[PDB]
Design an enzyme around this catalytic site. Structure first.
Site, mmCIF file in Angstrom:
data_model
loop_
_atom_site.group_PDB
_atom_site.id
_atom_site.type_symbol
_atom_site.label_atom_id
_atom_site.label_comp_id
_atom_site.label_asym_id
_atom_site.label_seq_id
_atom_site.Cartn_x
_atom_site.Cartn_y
_atom_site.Cartn_z
ATOM 1 N N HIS A 145 -1.818 -0.176 9.130
ATOM 2 C CA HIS A 145 -0.572 -0.940 9.083
ATOM 3 C C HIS A 145 0.571 -0.259 9.875
ATOM 4 C CE1 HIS A 145 1.682 1.217 5.985
ATOM 5 N NE2 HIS A 145 0.688 1.103 5.102
ATOM 6 N N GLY A 196 8.008 5.290 4.374
ATOM 7 C CA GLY A 196 7.697 6.361 5.309
ATOM 8 C C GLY A 196 6.654 7.340 4.798
ATOM 9 N N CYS A 221 3.563 6.543 3.780
ATOM 10 C CA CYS A 221 2.193 6.139 4.087
ATOM 11 C C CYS A 221 1.522 7.102 5.035
ATOM 12 C CB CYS A 221 2.110 4.698 4.573
ATOM 13 S SG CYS A 221 2.879 3.515 3.444
HETATM 14 C C1 LIG Z 1 7.310 -0.032 0.371
HETATM 15 C C2 LIG Z 1 6.349 1.111 0.166
HETATM 16 C C3 LIG Z 1 6.717 2.218 -0.601
HETATM 17 C C4 LIG Z 1 5.810 3.238 -0.807
HETATM 18 N N1 LIG Z 1 4.570 3.233 -0.313
HETATM 19 C C5 LIG Z 1 4.207 2.178 0.429
HETATM 20 C C6 LIG Z 1 5.048 1.096 0.706
HETATM 21 N N2 LIG Z 1 4.654 0.003 1.524
HETATM 22 C C7 LIG Z 1 4.054 -1.153 1.144
HETATM 23 O O1 LIG Z 1 3.587 -1.338 0.029
HETATM 24 C C8 LIG Z 1 4.002 -2.257 2.185
HETATM 25 N N3 LIG Z 1 4.584 -1.922 3.466
HETATM 26 C C9 LIG Z 1 5.869 -2.146 3.728
HETATM 27 O O2 LIG Z 1 6.554 -2.926 3.069
HETATM 28 C C10 LIG Z 1 6.462 -1.332 4.861
HETATM 29 C C11 LIG Z 1 5.695 -1.452 6.159
HETATM 30 C C12 LIG Z 1 6.245 -2.061 7.273
HETATM 31 C C13 LIG Z 1 5.516 -2.151 8.442
HETATM 32 C C14 LIG Z 1 4.243 -1.617 8.461
HETATM 33 N N4 LIG Z 1 3.683 -1.014 7.406
HETATM 34 C C15 LIG Z 1 4.412 -0.942 6.285
#
Ligand SMILES: Cc1ccncc1NC(=O)CNC(=O)Cc1cccnc1
Ligand SMILES: Cc1ccncc1NC(=O)CNC(=O)Cc1cccnc1
Lengths: 304, 304
Positions: free
Chosen positions: A41, A143, A145
């Site tokens: 992602h 951030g 991930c």
């Molecule tokens: C929000 C969050 C917080 C902690 N760990 C993970 C997350 N993220 C999620 O569940 C879902 N992804 C987003 O909302 C952000 C994003 C944008 C573009 C590409 N990848 C990810």
């Protein structure tokens, strides 16, 4: 003496963290040999996350679109491929700090350490367990991930988790290092509700053994039980069923303390039925389930 | 989201751990520049610990009696001195992995990470707090002495603790890196009982703020209080008095959540008087006091 929620020393994993950016999305990557592993992602915008077609989104990306930075130096990307939900970015430089490593897929109830990172930089380390519903209760912000979970056996790091998602309920989901999600979760910003978060019974019993070894013995009672009687109570309290395999795994703790596993089950059964009555066990007012029997043996014997 | 008991990434400190042996006693040392710091009780036998005269015991030791091993390579000791309760062993080689560092003496209520070591080898990392009675509740077995506590500010490691003793009650005592014990403790195997282990009020409030930021809000009530009224309840429950300095330190958490510090005090007062009623806050059935307001801000903002 004393018993603490303890993570593995993170140094070996710190030497593997890199920052990966694709367009406007920046997350963490794991650099092992000449490959950087990161959540696929990274190619999405928050808008793409609603319904992403990864293969299609990936066609619009070339090697030069993945920006990999280790410390303050840029790595050259010479290949990229998608394996399940992870991207593997081949770089022209093998990570000089690559520890001995393995990729393992853990079972529910297994614990591991997470090195929480932002922009490829480590912020902290904590101990997690893979919940019986295949979620983890971590501490992950935007951030984070690409942050990884691991166990260490002397000098070999077994990587077991990579952070991908936060479900609407604030619990976390991710994959092994082959990109396969734990549980039924998907890398899509959609309704994904978790199943019952049952208590890891074998871990609670191991922790009750750790409590006895460290002097907390008030909860030991004059009863015993059987696996079947115990399991009837366990079902009622949303505890995982205890199997003969779990009893076998607790054998060394039973031998060290002279407390039969089924006697400890009876103590646990009374704790479930009577409650703690305002008392604590190892400084906790609830029954801790994020220590495996192996973690208790390691911490109680000083395994380095 | 999610909030975890999180230690600092330990890599920088792992690169400093060495094994120090004097006669039949082996413990850990901290190698910074060309000096190895270790508990002075490395010169004692368990028998000497009953009533040791360190200056006298040290006269019988020369540089070659201190065996320092970093990994599997021996360091040459070219000097040794006693500073309070620590020995400083000058070696002929500066530690090539010496991070930027400071020696700080922390106040009670301050948290830090401990890298538990045995034979100069790291076994695990956990987060502690200096208790108001100057003990720490760690996880330390025989051979763990010389393990250190630290905080990290970006790339500078502030060392604040070195492990020396386990009191008869199973709680721990140690020194700063100048060898001065925290509290009234001494490096002698004698009756040393700890004072009241009161709860670190400012830390509980910071953690209640972390709970609100992460969605756990059930405990928020319709009341407010004053510092004086709150402190009357705090005294009754063995909580440390809350000062205007603590209210000031909680200011940014109050601003981020829109919950006045005195309103959170009133919520805490009701939690003390009514109990949790079988409920949990951030997965805990007791009020956690080993997160400072700074730790809450760091973890809730992702400081690397
Ligand atoms: C929000 C969050 C917080 C902690 N760990 C993970 C997350 N993220 C999620 O569940 C879902 N992804 C987003 O909302 C952000 C994003 C944008 C573009 C590409 N990848 C990810
Ligand atoms: C027993 C223990 C456990 C954890 N942390 C610390 C300790 N140690 C102590 O409180 C007291 N020292 C000993 O009994 C062992 C010893 C022998 C010779 C020279 N230094 C020390």
């Amino acid at each position: 003496s004393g018993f603490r929620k303890m993570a593995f020393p993170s140094g070996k994993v710190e030497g593997c963290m890199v920052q990966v950016t694709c367009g406007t999305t920046t997350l963490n990557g794991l650099w092992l040999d000449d490959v950087v592993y990161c959540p696929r992602h990274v190619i999405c915008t928050s808008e793409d996350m609603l319904n992403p077609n990864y293969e299609d989104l990936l066609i619009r990306k070339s090697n030069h679109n993945f920006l990999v930075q280790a410390g303050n130096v840029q790595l050259r990307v010479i290949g990229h491929s998608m394996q399940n939900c992870v991207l593997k970015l081949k770089v022209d430089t093998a990570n000089p700090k690559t520890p001995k490593y393995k990729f393992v897929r853990i079972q529910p109830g297994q614990t591991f350490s997470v090195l929480a990172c932002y922009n490829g930089s480590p912020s902290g380390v904590y101990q997690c367990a893979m919940r019986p519903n295949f979620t983890i209760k971590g501490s992950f912000l935007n951030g984070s991930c690409g942050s990884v979970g691991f166990n260490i056996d002397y000098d070999c790091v077994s990587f077991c988790y990579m952070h991908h998602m936060e479900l609407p309920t604030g619990v976390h989901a991710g994959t092994d290092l082959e990109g396969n999600f734990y549980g039924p979760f998907v890398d899509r910003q959609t309704a994904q509700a978790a199943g019952t978060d049952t208590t890891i019974t074998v871990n609670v019993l191991a922790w009750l053994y750790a409590a006895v070894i460290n002097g907390d013995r008030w909860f030991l009672n004059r009863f015993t039980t059987t696996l079947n009687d115990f399991n009837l109570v366990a079902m009622k309290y949303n505890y995982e069923p205890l199997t003969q395999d779990h009893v076998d795994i607790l054998g060394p703790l039973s031998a060290q303390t002279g407390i039969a596993v089924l006697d400890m089950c009876a103590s646990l059964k009374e704790l479930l039925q009577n409650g703690m009555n305002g008392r604590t066990i190892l400084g906790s007012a609830l029954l801790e389930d994020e220590f495996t029997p192996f973690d208790v043996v390691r911490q109680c014997s000083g395994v380095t």
